[PDB]
Design a protein around this ligand. Structure first.
Ligand SMILES: CCc1ccc(/C=C2\SC(N[C@H](C(=O)O)c3ccc(F)cc3)=NC2=O)o1
Length: 559
């Protein structure tokens, strides 16, 4: 029951890979400790293969089946529809990996004949064949981090034609099934603000609150064939068209359960018997599986008034404390149950009695104050990785602008406002590209967003208070201060001086650019403005922004 079997062939890159942080004339204005930033490459692929390769053992008890039965009952109320080839094509990212059959992403979005014809042949084959493993490509992810160096993560994905087929049969399912089965526990249905709200209300709903995050060690690798088949049995509970049931069964048997691994050179690298990270059901499957195992584990551990929040492989549990020693015992029992379910922890879980100290989804709840001096809760995170990626994007253009996504998700934070907003708006001003739409990701989905709409986006998602937060917590202030010293980022006085310049320039620009200066940089000036609700700013269609997770799903949503 090994997660992977290897042949010995190496995981090759598709081109040259840079490990050192690229430097240009703008780098030093953001940070000076360039040696602290690096990017993972295929050169470390071997190290990752060792960590992700191991034998899995599963002991499934009654709690597990009782939870699965309840999950299935809820899934049976779901009615999903098949997506036409056209609709599926439109969900394909403009920069999605080209097919090895004579066409690319652009060809798919344009609904070219060759692309559409090939997609129809793949679909037909899925209906006719339900046993032949489908080929997948394995690549070493190139991600930017700050030294503490971690090995590159592994990405496994099927051909573009197959991906479009996954959308046709499962897009509607993975988009609606999760919330129905897990209810309020499904994390991707919440925007950052609503997530905070849910956590805070949950924490206050307990007499003596106790919470903990559970970090599964290489979750994808802990996912067994049983887990993948159980997920399928849940999808099959929905009301689906016969053709959709057939495709789902075929995709599960031939793709989700496992398959051969081919490198960028076309060589056989090995065989996968666990979760593929680059398929449409990756986020939905991991979420359902984590929720199932964790729910059963909560019962085995006999936790009191248990409330969970699950986002893919990320999990947070808040319950009623029964004392320090008792909680420590309940946690060990939880971890033992999870281990039996094939979900061992990377780092032993610890009980927390302070909400702000619980980190889930690489984030945590913190508190600040608005203009009225009223306490306001918001979502934050350690800014180390966001700033490292910002430094990289400062000297190199990339498919996804993490800085943009971070400003949107973390607009209320001290670091996003002082540094990210200031630094990038300065750059956009100098290049006169304020109106140039840029791609970023939100819950795994790719979006094309115009920087000039940030004020409206921020007010809608975080409220006007996001433009006037002050008096951040001691812990938050210290974490940010720590990051700035580690990377060598200029102090507040410097960013304030720069923000004043950026603000003045935006104001003169008038229109949306003026709104950006007024709201985004109101913290810069000494005599803050009243900050009245933004005028005509409610046109963007943000309805599908926080519906579900799509990490690795190759999903693109049009604004
Ligand atoms: C990292 C070191 C550091 C610098 C500044 C702080 C703490 C701060 S700054 C602050 N308010 C100011 C303000 O003018 O309202 C502020 C400054 C910068 C920003 F991007 C937002 C808000 N309230 C706090 O508690 O910590």
């Amino acid at each position: 029951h090994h997660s992977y079997t290897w042949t010995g062939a190496l995981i090759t890159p598709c081109a040259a890979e840079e490990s050192k942080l690229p430097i240009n004339a703008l780098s030093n204005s953001l940070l000076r400790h360039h040696n602290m930033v690096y990017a993972t490459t295929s050169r470390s692929a071997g190290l990752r293969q060792k960590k992700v390769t191991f034998d899995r053992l599963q002991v499934l008890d009654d709690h597990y089946r009782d939870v699965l039965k309840e999950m299935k009952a809820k899934a049976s109320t779901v009615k999903a529809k098949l997506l036409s080839v056209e609709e599926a094509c439109k969900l394909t990212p403009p920069h999605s990996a080209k097919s090895k059959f004579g066409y690319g992403a652009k060809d798919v979005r344009n609904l070219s004949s060759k692309a559409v014809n090939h997609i129809h042949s793949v679909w037909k084959d899925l209906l006719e064949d339900t046993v032949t493993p489908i080929d997948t490509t394995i690549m070493a992810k190139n991600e930017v981090f700050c030294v503490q160096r971690k090995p590159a993560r592994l990405i496994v994905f099927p051909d573009l034609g197959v991906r479009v087929c996954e959308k046709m049969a499962l897009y509607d399912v993975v988009s609606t099934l999760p919330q129905v089965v897990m209810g309020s526990s499904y994390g991707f249905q919440y925007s950052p603000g609503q997530r905070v709200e849910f956590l805070v209300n949950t924490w206050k709903s307990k007499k003596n609150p106790m919470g903990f995050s559970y970090d599964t060690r290489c979750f994808d690798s802990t996912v067994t064939e049983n887990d993948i088949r159980v997920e399928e049995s849940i999808y099959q509970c929905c009301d689906l068209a016969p053709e959709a049931r057939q495709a789902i069964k075929s995709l599960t048997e031939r793709l989700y359960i496992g398959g051969p691994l081919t490198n960028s050179k076309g060589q056989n690298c090995g065989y996968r018997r666990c979760r593929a990270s680059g398929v449409l059901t990756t986020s939905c499957g991991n979420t359902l599986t984590c929720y199932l195992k964790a729910s059963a584990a909560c019962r085995a551990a006999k936790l009191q008034d248990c409330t969970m929040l699950v986002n893919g492989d990320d999990l947070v549990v808040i319950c009623e404390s029964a004392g320090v020693q008792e909680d420590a015992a309940s946690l060990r029992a939880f971890t033992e149950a999870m281990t039996r379910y094939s979900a061992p922890p990377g780092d032993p879980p610890q009980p927390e009695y302070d909400l702000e100290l619980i980190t889930s989804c690489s984030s945590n709840v913190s508190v600040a104050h608005d203009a009225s001096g009223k306490r306001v809760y918001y979502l934050t995170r350690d800014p180390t990785t966001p700033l490292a990626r910002a430094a990289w994007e400062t000297a190199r253009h990339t498919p996804v602008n993490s800085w943009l996504g971070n400003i949107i998700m973390y607009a209320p934070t001290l670091w996003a406002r002082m540094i990210l907003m200031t630094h990038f708006f300065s750059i956009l001003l100098a290049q006169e590209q304020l109106e140039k739409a840029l791609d970023c990701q939100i819950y795994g989905a790719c979006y094309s967003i115009e920087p000039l709409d940030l004020p409206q986006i921020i007010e809608r998602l975080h409220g006007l208070s996001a433009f006037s937060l002050h008096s951040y917590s001691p812990g938050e202030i210290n974490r940010v201060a720590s990051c700035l010293r580690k990377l060598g980022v200029p102090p507040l006085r410097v960013w304030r001086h720069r923000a004043r310049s950026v603000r003045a320039r935006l104001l003169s620009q008038g229109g949306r650019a003026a709104t950006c200066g007024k709201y985004l940089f109101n913290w810069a000036v000494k005599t803050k403005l009243k900050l009245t609700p933004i005028p005509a700013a409610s046109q963007l269609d943000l309805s599908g922004w926080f519906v579900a997770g799509y990490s690795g799903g190759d999903i693109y949503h049009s604004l």
